[PDB]
Structure formats: C-alpha cells, structure tokens
GROMACS .gro file of N, CA and C in nm:
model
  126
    1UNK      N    1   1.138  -9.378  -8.595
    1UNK     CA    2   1.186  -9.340  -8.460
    1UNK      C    3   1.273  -9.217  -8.463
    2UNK      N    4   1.282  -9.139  -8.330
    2UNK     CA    5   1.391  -9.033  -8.354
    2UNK      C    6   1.477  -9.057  -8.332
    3UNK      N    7   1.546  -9.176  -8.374
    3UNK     CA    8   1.718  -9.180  -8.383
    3UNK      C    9   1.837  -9.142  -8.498
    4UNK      N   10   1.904  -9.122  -8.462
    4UNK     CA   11   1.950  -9.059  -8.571
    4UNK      C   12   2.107  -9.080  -8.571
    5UNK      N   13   2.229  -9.144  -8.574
    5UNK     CA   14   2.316  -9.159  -8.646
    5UNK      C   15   2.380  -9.049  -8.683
    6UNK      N   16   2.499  -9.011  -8.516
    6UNK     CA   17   2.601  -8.882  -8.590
    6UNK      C   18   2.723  -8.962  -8.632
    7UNK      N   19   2.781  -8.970  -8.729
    7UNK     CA   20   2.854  -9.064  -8.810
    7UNK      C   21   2.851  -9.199  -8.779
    8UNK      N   22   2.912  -9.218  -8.617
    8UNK     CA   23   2.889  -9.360  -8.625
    8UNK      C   24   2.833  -9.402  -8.443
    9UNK      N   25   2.803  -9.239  -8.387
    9UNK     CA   26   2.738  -9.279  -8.261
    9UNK      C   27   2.596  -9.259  -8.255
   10UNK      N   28   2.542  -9.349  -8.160
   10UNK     CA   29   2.391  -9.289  -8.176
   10UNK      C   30   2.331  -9.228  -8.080
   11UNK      N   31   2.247  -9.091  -8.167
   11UNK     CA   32   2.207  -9.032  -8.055
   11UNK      C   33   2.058  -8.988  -8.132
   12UNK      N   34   1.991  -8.933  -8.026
   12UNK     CA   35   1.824  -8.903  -8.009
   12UNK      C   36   1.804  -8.754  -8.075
   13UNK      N   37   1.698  -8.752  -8.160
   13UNK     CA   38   1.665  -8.658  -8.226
   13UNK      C   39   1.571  -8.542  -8.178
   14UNK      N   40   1.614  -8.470  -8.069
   14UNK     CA   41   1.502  -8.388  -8.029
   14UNK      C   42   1.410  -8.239  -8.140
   15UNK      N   43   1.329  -8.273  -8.150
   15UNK     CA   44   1.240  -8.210  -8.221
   15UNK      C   45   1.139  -8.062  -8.145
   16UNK      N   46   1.204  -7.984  -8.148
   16UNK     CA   47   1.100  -7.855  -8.041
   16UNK      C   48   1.207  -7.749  -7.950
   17UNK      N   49   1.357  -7.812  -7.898
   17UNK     CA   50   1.481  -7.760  -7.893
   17UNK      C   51   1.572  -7.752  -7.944
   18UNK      N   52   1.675  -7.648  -7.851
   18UNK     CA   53   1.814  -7.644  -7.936
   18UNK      C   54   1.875  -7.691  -7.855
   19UNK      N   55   1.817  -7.738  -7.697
   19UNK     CA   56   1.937  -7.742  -7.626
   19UNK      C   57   1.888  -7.895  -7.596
   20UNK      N   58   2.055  -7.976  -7.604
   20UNK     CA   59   2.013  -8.116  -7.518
   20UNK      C   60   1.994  -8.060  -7.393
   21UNK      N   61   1.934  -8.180  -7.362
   21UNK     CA   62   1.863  -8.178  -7.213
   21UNK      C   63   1.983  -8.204  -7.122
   22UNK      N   64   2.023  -8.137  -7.032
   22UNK     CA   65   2.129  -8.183  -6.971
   22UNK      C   66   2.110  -8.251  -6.860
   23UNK      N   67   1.984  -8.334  -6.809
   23UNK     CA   68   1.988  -8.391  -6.736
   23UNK      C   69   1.992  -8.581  -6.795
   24UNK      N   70   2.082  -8.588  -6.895
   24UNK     CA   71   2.090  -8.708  -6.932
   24UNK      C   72   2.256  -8.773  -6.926
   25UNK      N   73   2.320  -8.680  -6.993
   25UNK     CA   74   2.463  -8.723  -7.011
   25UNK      C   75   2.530  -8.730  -7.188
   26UNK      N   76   2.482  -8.637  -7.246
   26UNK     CA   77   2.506  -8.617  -7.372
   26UNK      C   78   2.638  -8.544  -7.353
   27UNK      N   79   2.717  -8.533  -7.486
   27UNK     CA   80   2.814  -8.492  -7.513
   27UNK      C   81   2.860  -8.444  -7.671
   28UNK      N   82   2.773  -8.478  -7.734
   28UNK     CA   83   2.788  -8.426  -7.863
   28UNK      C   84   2.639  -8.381  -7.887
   29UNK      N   85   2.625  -8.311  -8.008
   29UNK     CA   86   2.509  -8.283  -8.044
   29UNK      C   87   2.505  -8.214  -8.208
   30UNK      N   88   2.414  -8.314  -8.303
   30UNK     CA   89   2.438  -8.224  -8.438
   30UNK      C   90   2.305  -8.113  -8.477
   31UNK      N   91   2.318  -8.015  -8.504
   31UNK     CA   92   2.207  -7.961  -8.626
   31UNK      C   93   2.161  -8.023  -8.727
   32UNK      N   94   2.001  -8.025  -8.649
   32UNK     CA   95   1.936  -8.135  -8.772
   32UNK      C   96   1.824  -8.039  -8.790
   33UNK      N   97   1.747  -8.124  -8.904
   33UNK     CA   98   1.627  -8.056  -8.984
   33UNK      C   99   1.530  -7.991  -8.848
   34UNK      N  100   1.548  -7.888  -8.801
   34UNK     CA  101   1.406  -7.804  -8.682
   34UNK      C  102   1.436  -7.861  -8.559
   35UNK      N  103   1.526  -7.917  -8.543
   35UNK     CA  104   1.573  -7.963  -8.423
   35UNK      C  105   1.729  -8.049  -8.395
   36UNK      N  106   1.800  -8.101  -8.284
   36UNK     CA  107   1.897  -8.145  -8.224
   36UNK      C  108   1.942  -8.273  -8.210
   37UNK      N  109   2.002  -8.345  -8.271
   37UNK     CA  110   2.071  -8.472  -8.240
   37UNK      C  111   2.170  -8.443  -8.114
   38UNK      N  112   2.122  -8.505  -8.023
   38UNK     CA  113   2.219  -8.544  -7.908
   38UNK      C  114   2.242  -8.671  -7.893
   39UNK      N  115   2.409  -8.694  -7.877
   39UNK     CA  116   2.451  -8.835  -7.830
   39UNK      C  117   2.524  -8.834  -7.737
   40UNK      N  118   2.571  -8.941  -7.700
   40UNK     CA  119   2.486  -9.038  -7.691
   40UNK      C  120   2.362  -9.070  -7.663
   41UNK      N  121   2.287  -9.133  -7.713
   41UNK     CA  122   2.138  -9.224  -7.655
   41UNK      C  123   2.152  -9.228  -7.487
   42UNK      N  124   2.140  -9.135  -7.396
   42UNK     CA  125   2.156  -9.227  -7.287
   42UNK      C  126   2.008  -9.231  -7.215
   0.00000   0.00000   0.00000
C-alpha cells in the first residue's frame, strides 16, 4: 500500500507529485523515493 509512516504519523505516499493535494487537509509532508509523503492520512 502507499502508506508510509513519518516517524510516528501516518500519511499517504503520493507517487507522480511534489505537491500534496491541498484539497484534503495535510500538514506535513516528507521527501520520499520519486515522490511525497503527506500526513496526515485524511
């Protein structure tokens, strides 16, 4: 699955951007392998 675990919150691994999607409610976001961890999961 694309989840992914930024230390200890979880958030969704987008694969194809850099930018979270801001129509969700994210607030963090890490640099991952070709794409974006945004968390929270919402």
């Amino acid at each position: 699955g694309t989840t992914c675990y930024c230390g200890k919150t979880i958030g969704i691994y987008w694969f194809g951007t850099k930018t979270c999607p801001s129509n969700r409610g994210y607030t963090g976001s890490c640099g991952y392998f070709l794409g974006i961890c945004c968390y929270p999961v919402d």
